Amino acid sequence: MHLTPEEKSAVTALWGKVNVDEVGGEALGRLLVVYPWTQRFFESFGDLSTPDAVMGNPKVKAHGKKVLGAFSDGLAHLDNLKGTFATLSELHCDKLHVDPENFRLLGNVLVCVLAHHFGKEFTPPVQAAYQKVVAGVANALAHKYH
Amino acid sequence: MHLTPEEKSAVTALWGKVNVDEVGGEALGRLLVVYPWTQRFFESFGDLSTPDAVMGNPKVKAHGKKVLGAFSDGLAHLDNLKGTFATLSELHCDKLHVDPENFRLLGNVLVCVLAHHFGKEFTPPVQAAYQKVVAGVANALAHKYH
Amino acid sequence: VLSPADKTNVKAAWGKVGAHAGEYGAEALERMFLSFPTTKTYFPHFDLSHGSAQVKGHGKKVADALTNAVAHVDDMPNALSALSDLHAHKLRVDPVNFKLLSHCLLVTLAAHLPAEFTPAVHASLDKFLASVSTVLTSKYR
Amino acid sequence: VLSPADKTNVKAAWGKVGAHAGEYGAEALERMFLSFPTTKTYFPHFDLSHGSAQVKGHGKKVADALTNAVAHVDDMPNALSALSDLHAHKLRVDPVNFKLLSHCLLVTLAAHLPAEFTPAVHASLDKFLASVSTVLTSKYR
Numbered sequence: 001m002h003l004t005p006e007e008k009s010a011v012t013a014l015w016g017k018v019n020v021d022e023v024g025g026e027a028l029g030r031l032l033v034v035y036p037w038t039q040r041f042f043e044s045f046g047d048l049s050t051p052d053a054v055m056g057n058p059k060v061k062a063h064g065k066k067v068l069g070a071f072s073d074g075l076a077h078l079d080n081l082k083g084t085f086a087t088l089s090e091l092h093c094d095k096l097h098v099d100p101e102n103f104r105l106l107g108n109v110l111v112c113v114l115a116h117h118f119g120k121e122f123t124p125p126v127q128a129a130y131q132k133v134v135a136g137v138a139n140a141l142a143h144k145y146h
Numbered sequence: 147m148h149l150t151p152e153e154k155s156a157v158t159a160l161w162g163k164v165n166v167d168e169v170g171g172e173a174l175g176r177l178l179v180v181y182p183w184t185q186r187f188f189e190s191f192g193d194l195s196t197p198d199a200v201m202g203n204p205k206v207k208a209h210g211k212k213v214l215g216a217f218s219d220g221l222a223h224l225d226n227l228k229g230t231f232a233t234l235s236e237l238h239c240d241k242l243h244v245d246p247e248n249f250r251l252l253g254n255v256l257v258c259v260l261a262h263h264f265g266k267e268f269t270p271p272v273q274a275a276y277q278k279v280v281a282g283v284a285n286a287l288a289h290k291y292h
Numbered sequence: 293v294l295s296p297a298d299k300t301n302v303k304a305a306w307g308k309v310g311a312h313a314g315e316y317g318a319e320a321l322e323r324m325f326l327s328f329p330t331t332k333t334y335f336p337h338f339d340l341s342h343g344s345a346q347v348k349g350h351g352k353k354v355a356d357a358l359t360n361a362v363a364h365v366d367d368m369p370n371a372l373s374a375l376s377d378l379h380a381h382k383l384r385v386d387p388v389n390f391k392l393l394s395h396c397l398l399v400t401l402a403a404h405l406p407a408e409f410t411p412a413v414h415a416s417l418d419k420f421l422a423s424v425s426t427v428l429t430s431k432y433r
Numbered sequence: 434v435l436s437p438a439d440k441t442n443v444k445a446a447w448g449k450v451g452a453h454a455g456e457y458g459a460e461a462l463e464r465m466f467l468s469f470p471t472t473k474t475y476f477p478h479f480d481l482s483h484g485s486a487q488v489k490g491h492g493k494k495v496a497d498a499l500t501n502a503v504a505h506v507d508d509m510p511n512a513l514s515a516l517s518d519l520h521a522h523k524l525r526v527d528p529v530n531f532k533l534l535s536h537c538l539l540v541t542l543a544a545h546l547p548a549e550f551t552p553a554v555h556a557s558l559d560k561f562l563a564s565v566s567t568v569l570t571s572k573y574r
């Protein structure tokens with residue numbers, strides 16, 4: 001996690017404009033459509049057989065909002081990602097049994113979603129900062145695995 | 147490194163039995179044969195058309211000993227891999243233009259050669275400590291890339 | 293394998309790119325160089341500053357090769373054969389790098405095609421770039 | 434693609450494995466669980482302690498599917514279609530993990546077959562495990 005000060009202002013500046021509820025549902029939904037194997041964790045969510053079934057599923061949207069709410073909260077603690085996500089790391093490992101590669105896939109999908117929403121505003125340098133942030137978050141969510 | 151004392155000592159005790167000249171030559175040679183694209187950095191070493199020519203190539207052998215020699219000296223700085231390999235990281239990036247993914251490939255090949263040499267002694271717990279060392283070294287070697 | 297629907301999605305999305313391919317290629321490359329700096333090790337002979345002519349020129353070459361694969365979507369291993377030889381025998385780029393460029397191409401398309409970059413299309417494009425990458429890497433060893 | 438020399442190399446090495454296949458499967462899994470703890474997330478229902486019967490039994494199944502792949506080396510997709518379906522639609526193991534098991538299998542082979550694990554054979558075995566992995570993940574999407 002080497003975020004220069006200017007990288008950090010870029011990340012925070014953009015994040016200020018995000019509707020986390022909406023972006024959360026899009027990112028989780030697209031993860032499940034593009035990388036269908038990630039659906040293994042959500043069998044209680046009902047119908048996930050087509051793109052519209054996944055994107056409009058109320059459980060997928062509510063879960064996306066929850067995932068991204070916790071992610072935002074992490075953007076307020078960029079100097080202590082490990083500490084911030086420690087109990088979630090443990091939970092994902094010991095209770096939910098989620099392969100940490102899933103955090104990396106979600107990070108990449110989140111980057112495409114941000115690109116989709118912001119267009120030109122998501123410049124190459126802004127992307128580069130966000131790539132360090134999603135990797136830092138993925139690493140923090142994995143740090144308690146054993 | 148996040149090495150445990152029993153892990154640290156498992157690494158160190160095994161390493162004291164290693165013939166660095168032979169293992170270096172074998173690790174670098176296997177790298178060029180298993181992953182042929184890695185030959186791109188060694189056009190001036192001569193003939194590398196066949197495994198026999200690669201393994202018998204004296205420049206491959208001498209380069210292998212040099213690489214493992216530096217790795218060897220790094221095993222005495224486990225609490226500070228980043229600082230030990232900093233100048234080397236810079237050289238690999240700025241002068242040699244070596245994709246760090248190559249460091250990972252060599253690490254894995256190196257682990258296979260240790261197993262080949264030590265057999266029964268290269269137990270699953272001993273492998274796990276070495277996998278951590280080899281990733282640690284790769285990461286230290288890539289740290290100054292920009 | 294690409295399905296009928298994938299092929300349709302890719303031709304549709306690439307059709308809207310049209311005469312922007314080159315520009316999008318160069319932007320994909322710049323994104324890659326900045327987000328994944330290790331990829332710069334393959335271009336030591338290029339000037340990589342913003343707006344560099346070598347980057348634009350190479351962007352166009354990449355985009356044209358992608359355009360050719362879309363035009364021969366049912367015969368890609370044969371349409372990209374020469375490029376496959378070049379990458380395996382001369383350039384020898386490590387396979388992990390293909391995923392990095394593919395991701396940056398998707399970010400670039402998302403940034404420019406807001407109406408066409410639906411979930412289904414994103415899925416098809418991702419599968420397409422992975423098949424291209426597989427072909428380009430098929431003769432490595 | 435597997436060359437004729439590769440098939441010969443792989444058949445020879447696996448032939449020597451012989452009746453130890455099951456033992457080597459189990460040892461490869463154990464090395465994977467220890468070296469790459471994230472892989473344990475796919476086996477929360479197993480007792481993963483040293484010498485557990487679940488690991489042994491699973492090691493046998495893995496080893497037997499590989500024996501079958503070696504015997505059907507020229508027709509892998511067909512011989513493994515069922516396992517390919519299983520991994521794609523039920524188990525849904527992330528593709529990155531196949532590399533991790535493959536590496537641990539190689540280390541196991543290197544450790545038990547010193548004379549047979551030559552550079553050329555090491556190369557062929559790695560290509561073979563990669564093709565098997567490709568096949569097992571070919572229907573994921």
Ligand code: HEM
Binds near residue numbers: 067
């Ligand atoms: C940015 C990374 C992520 C963050 C910050 C995050 C955060 C959270 C939070 C706050 C919860 C609720 C915890 C609770 O119930 O006590 C949760 C639950 C869950 N997460 Fe994660 N998550 C992330 C990524 C993922 C991904 C990629 C997957 C799998 C593809 C996943 C799978 C799950 C599952 C299965 C649950 C439980 C759902 C249920 O209630 O049945 N998470 N996550």
Ligand code: HEM
Binds near residue numbers: 188214248287
């Ligand atoms: C364990 C990881 C590695 C270590 C510790 C290491 C270390 C070294 C050292 C000490 C040198 C001598 C530099 C000098 O003369 O000042 C060197 C040179 C070099 N290394 Fe690495 N190396 C590693 C891996 C690799 C790999 C994987 C590659 C490419 C496949 C590579 C490519 C080179 C090249 C091309 C040179 C210059 C050789 C020449 O002068 O012709 N290295 N390395």
Ligand code: HEM
Binds near residue numbers: 354
């Ligand atoms: C989508 C995948 C890719 C495609 C379609 C593609 C296509 C091409 C094309 C058309 C050329 C020009 C060859 C000629 O002059 O005819 C080329 C060259 C080249 N590519 Fe690839 N490429 C891909 C990915 C990559 C990646 C991932 C790298 C490494 C990061 C890479 C590195 C290079 C290099 C160094 C050259 C030579 C550049 C020069 O010296 O002019 N390519 N590629």
Ligand code: HEM
Binds near residue numbers: 476
């Ligand atoms: C070398 C490639 C692999 C092959 C040939 C292979 C083969 C098999 C076979 C034969 C089965 C048993 C199906 C049955 O009971 O009839 C199986 C199941 C399974 N495999 Fe794969 N496997 C491979 C890689 C992996 C990897 C990398 C993982 C995840 C880390 C994995 C996870 C599983 C799991 C969780 C099961 C079900 C275990 C159970 O509940 O008994 N496999 N595999």
